[PDB]
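Assemble and predict.
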Amino acid sequence: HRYRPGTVALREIRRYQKSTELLIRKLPFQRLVREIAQDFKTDLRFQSSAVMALQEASEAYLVGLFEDTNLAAIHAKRVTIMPKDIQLARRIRGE
Amino acid sequence: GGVMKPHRYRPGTVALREIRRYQKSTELLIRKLPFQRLVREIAQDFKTDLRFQSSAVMALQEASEAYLVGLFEDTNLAAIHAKRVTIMPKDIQLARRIRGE
Amino acid sequence: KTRSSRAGLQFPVGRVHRLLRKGNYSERVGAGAPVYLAAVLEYLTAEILELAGNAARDNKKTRIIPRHLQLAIRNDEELNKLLGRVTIAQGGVLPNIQAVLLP
Amino acid sequence: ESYSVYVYKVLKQVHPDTGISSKAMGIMNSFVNDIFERIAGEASRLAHYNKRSTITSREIQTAVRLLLPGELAKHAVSEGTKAVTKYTS
Amino acid sequence: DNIQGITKPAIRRLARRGGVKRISGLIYEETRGVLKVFLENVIRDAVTYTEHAKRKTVTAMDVVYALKRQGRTLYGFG
Amino acid sequence: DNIQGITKPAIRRLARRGGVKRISGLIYEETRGVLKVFLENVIRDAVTYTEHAKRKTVTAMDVVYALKRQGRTLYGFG
Amino acid sequence: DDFRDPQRWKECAKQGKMPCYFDLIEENVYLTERKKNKSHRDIKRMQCECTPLSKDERAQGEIACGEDCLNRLLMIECSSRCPNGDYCSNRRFQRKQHADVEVILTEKKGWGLRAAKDLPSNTFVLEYCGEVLDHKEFKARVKEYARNKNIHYYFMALKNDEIIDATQKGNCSRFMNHSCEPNCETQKWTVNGQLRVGFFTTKLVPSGSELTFDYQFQRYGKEAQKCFCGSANCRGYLGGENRVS
Amino acid sequence: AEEGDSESEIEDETFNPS
């Protein structure tokens, strides 16, 4: 017994639009953040709530960008999203 | 013995010529008195017996023309991304959806 | 002598100091602040006027027009970022045609 | 009262034999007023977060570095620093 | 009906300034509604500023303040 | 090289929350660059506020102010 | 065979060997020209967008303003303010770059032209030049001249109100005939604000082959005429009982 | 040797300092 392609995808869409947890891990994001920050001022030290706010804002931005990417892909009469859809969404958005 | 006409332009040449002609100039593209009557008619719904200046309608016309030109500039990119040349109202609705309107 | 002659600027300092106390920003403006802000405004004004003068000489004219200001602002990488949400009256747009429309 | 004669004084230094229309003068007036309001509002925001009662060249410099782009803000900070150095010396 | 005073070649001329090569037949009826909504919003805020200022004429600075409220700064009419 | 720590299942779960049914193989290198521009703007503003506040430690209110400056307005951290 | 000489000679009307019974003509002349046009208010300049080099010709050298120019695609010739200057190739009505033509007898339908050498597609041949009429004079001179029993009527309508006469003065483009298999045609080029009519080729015409252009068919009177070519589907007569202009 | 229509400039006069 195997599922036909798309059933597990819709099942994941349903469960991750139902859940509210964070999707990106914490130590790789923290190592990314501590590495980017040092290029603006010397000896940076971090609280936990600063990175906890950065992760919320980053995932909200990415979900709000993939929604318009999906809208562009549906408008192009396709299902698969492409990087040109992301480029069109960031061109119309004003970035 | 008849008078023959030379030829007829292919569809698109006069349109691109008008694109260059109206991207070169800087002027008002809408008639002024129908715009003034439209603004006064839609302003009767908020306060009866108002009065307007001339720069107050000129600024509205400048803002409206800039808004419509920007809307068509995004809508043309939508229509090109849809692999077409003709511009549809679904392209306008997609531009107003992605822009946030 | 005036403070604009002391600092070596061209924009005034007393008018900037008057607009800083008058416009309800803090229970106190500092000092070096109107001189610093007048230098920043003079630099930005000189940059805009330099690019506008170049755009005016490029079309065989001797008077700067709002179309020349529009071309000077929109043909620059950072001034377009600073003035992205600003509509200039009688300015027009940039001439460009997409490459999928030309025969 | 406006900045028109000062815009003429700046214009006659970078391009001597040129002129400017009144509409462009009004656009430059609006530009100077808009940049003044932006920098003054951001410097007013910076002085409240630290519970200080003033505004200072450090506050104006921090409002310049946040608002202007990368290559423009460096020259703006350099010109303002030179002008505030020439004021006391 | 003064919304029909915004004629078809005016919308076509705005689309030629916007870079549009070929136009369908419903863009005019879409553009009239878009322009109507935008003008209703800006006129509502401008008449609100005018009624607050106790005047009866609507000046141009009220229009500039309403356009600044929408987020569209206009240089020239100050 | 910690932007490879934003793995392919994490971007796929973010796209499943975004409503995307089918995903190509080139989305990930674009998404990492967009995320590493958005971070390189917000942390730049946060380190500027920290460098003004005469502080060794980047707090959360600096991040909230850096997001308020760009028009994001995050609630929940003060 | 052409032999353009200013001395009038002893050939009556057929103009096949002696061209000096009528007069020739340069770029056309006007009668009631007034300063109401789009000449120098919005078509002041229409400059192409080109970033050339112009220092490397005859070796890795592309010709200036080819078929990628903004003006050649939109059927406009450049002005003197071109960035190529005196190296631009759009200005073909002004530098008088023509094709090698000759006028001899081919068929008893009349006189015409045959190609001297090989001539590729989209290549300029000759400019239609004549005398520009106006509103009132056309409908008077056509009924004044119909009673003179002429065979050839040299009338071409430039616009809805402009009809050019190439009878009193005409260049070498007045002899070209009609056929239902056209290899040349007519185009509407805009030079110096004014509209001009030219002749381009469409195929690879061999050396010694016919060069005619298609008429947009028209009758003005009661009688009818017919063509003598007969390529494959020659109608000869007009398009029925039409009366448009 | 060639010039544009002055009406272009007439619609927007120069700023008068007085």
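Chain F touches chain D at residues 45, 48-49, 52-53, 61, 65, 69 (CB under 8 Å).
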